[PDB]
From Swiss-Prot, chain A:
Subunit structure: Homotrimer. Part of tripartite efflux systems, which are composed of an inner membrane transporter, a periplasmic membrane fusion protein, and an outer membrane component, TolC. The complexes form a large protein conduit and can translocate molecules across both the inner and outer membranes. TolC interacts with the membrane fusion proteins AcrA, EmrA and MacA.
Domain of life: Bacteria
This protein's domain notes: Forms a continuous, solvent-accessible conduit: a 'channel-tunnel' over 140 Angstroms long that spans both the outer membrane and periplasmic space. The periplasmic or proximal end of the tunnel is sealed by sets of coiled helices.
Function: Outer membrane channel, which is required for the function of several efflux systems such as AcrAB-TolC, AcrEF-TolC, EmrAB-TolC and MacAB-TolC. These systems are involved in export of antibiotics and other toxic compounds from the cell. TolC is also involved in import of colicin E1 into the cells.
Protein name: Outer membrane protein TolC
Covered residues, full protein: 347 to 395 of 493
Similarity section: Belongs to the outer membrane factor (OMF) (TC 1.B.17) family.
Effect of residue 47 to A: Decreases inhibition by hexaamminecobalt(3+)
Phenotype of gene-disrupted mutants: Cannot grow on efflux substrates novobiocin or fusidic acid.
Subcellular localization: Cell outer membrane
Swiss-Prot record, chain B:
UniProt subcellular location: Cell inner membrane
Protein name: Multidrug efflux pump subunit AcrA
Loss of function: phenotype: Cannot grow on efflux substrates novobiocin or fusidic acid.
TM region positions: none
Described function: AcrA-AcrB-AcrZ-TolC is a drug efflux protein complex with broad substrate specificity that uses the proton motive force to export substrates. This subunit may act as an adapter protein that links AcrB and TolC stably together. It is elongated in shape, being long enough to span the periplasm.
Whole-protein residues included: 79 to 131 of 397
Length: 49, 53
């Protein structure tokens, strides 16, 4: 149960990374939608931050 | 009246200044509603320039 716990933790935690590695690519896209959206003016500086 | 009577008038010359006070009012109320068009069309222009970027 201990060995299969870690082996089924690391198989989760790879997919956990590829979840939250996409969640960066979401949020890095959403940030750059703000920095381009604030440099032209549609979104404000607090919707940036 | 804006002419010497009996003279020779050029084309496009004012003969009689007619009372403009109900046409100057409409000319302002078109030019007023012009600015109602081209202030909103300022912004819908500027939204697209904020969207093309």
């Amino acid at each position: 149960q201990t060995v299969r716990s870690s082996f089924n933790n690391i198989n989760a935690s790879i997919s956990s990374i590829n979840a939250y590695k996409q969640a960066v690519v979401s949020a890095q896209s959403s940030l750059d939608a703000m920095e381009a959206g604030y440099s032209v003016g549609t979104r404000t500086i607090v919707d940036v931050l | 009246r804006n002419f010497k009577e009996g003279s020779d008038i050029e084309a496009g010359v004012s003969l009689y200044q007619i009372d403009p006070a109900t046409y100057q009012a409409t000319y302002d109320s078109a030019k007023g509603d012009l600015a109602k068009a081209q202030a909103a069309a300022n912004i819908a222009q500027l939204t697209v320039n904020r969207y093309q970027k």
